[PDB]
């Protein structure tokens, strides 16, 4: 996202506004305002590694844009929007993750290697790999009888088709010392 | 299938380590273990 000092009304504000958002969602409900539309209206931009050196990024938009003119103990401790020089904003910080990590529920609550682990196990899982599994003649193929979408999901799974094509089942689980088996 | 089509190989001074520049370009956790760890990166 692009952030501009340019604003008649107050501070340095993020180019993309509440109107563009509903204008996109109009095209979402149809199934005219595309991704390229944001790109050519100059609301959004492509930043490589070299160019990343010369910019200043906000994590959250709203949460990291209008300054201070009660606080929940339950939430994690976040920093501040002390910076006034912000050039760009982060679309979403969960987009730093790739396909495998994106299926992990609450990865920010796990020890980092436990995630590097699960990111390698879902490749050894089982489920529906394609709907044409009955027409295709592959050497070896595993299909789960009764796949179930997870009860705990990620907003990224929407784009990953995980809910449509699952890899597991929602087991009713007890963490207990029982027979010692 | 998805994670295989988004795969990266680094052939062959410390490439395995997760670098600051990798932020938002490559997955911090998606790497194998062993001989491959840190050279097989995922977008």
């Amino acid at each position: 996202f692009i952030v501009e000092d340019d604003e008649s009304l107050g501070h340095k504000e993020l180019k993309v506004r509440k109107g563009h958002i509903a204008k996109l969602m109009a095209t979402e409900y149809q199934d005219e305002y595309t991704w390229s539309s944001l790109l050519n209206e100059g609301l959004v931009e492509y930043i490589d590694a070299e160019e990343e050196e010369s910019i200043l990024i906000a994590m959250q938009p709203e949460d990291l844009e209008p300054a201070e003119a009660d606080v929940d103990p339950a939430k994690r401790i976040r920093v501040s929007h002390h910076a006034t020089t912000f050039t760009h904003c982060e679309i979403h910080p969960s987009m730093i993750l790739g396909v495998a990590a994106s299926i992990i529920p609450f990865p920010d609550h796990n020890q980092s290697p436990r995630n590097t682990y699960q990111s390698a196990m879902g490749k050894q899982a089982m489920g529906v790999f394609l709907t044409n599994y009955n027409v295709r003649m592959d050497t070896m193929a595993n299909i789960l009888y009764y796949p179930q979408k997870p009860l705990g999901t990620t907003r990224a799974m929407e784009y990953l088709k995980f809910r449509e094509l699952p890899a597991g089942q929602n087991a009713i689980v007890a963490i207990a010392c029982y027979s010692g088996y | 299938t998805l994670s295989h089509l988004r795969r990266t190989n680094t052939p062959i001074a410390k490439p395995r380590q997760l670098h600051n520049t990798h932020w938002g370009l490559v997955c911090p956790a998606e790497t194998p273990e062993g001989q491959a760890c840190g050279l097989v990166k995922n977008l």
Partner: peptide, 30 residues
């Protein structure tokens, strides 16, 4: 309010549009 600042939840509508247009194997194809 057609040009009111965006919420943190809104970011998903942007991301949504990126995929609708690009897809997950964009780079292979392009």
């Amino acid at each position: 309010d057609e040009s009111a600042p965006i919420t943190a939840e809104d970011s998903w509508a942007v991301i949504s549009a990126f995929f609708r247009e690009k897809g997950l194997v964009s780079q292979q194809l392009d």
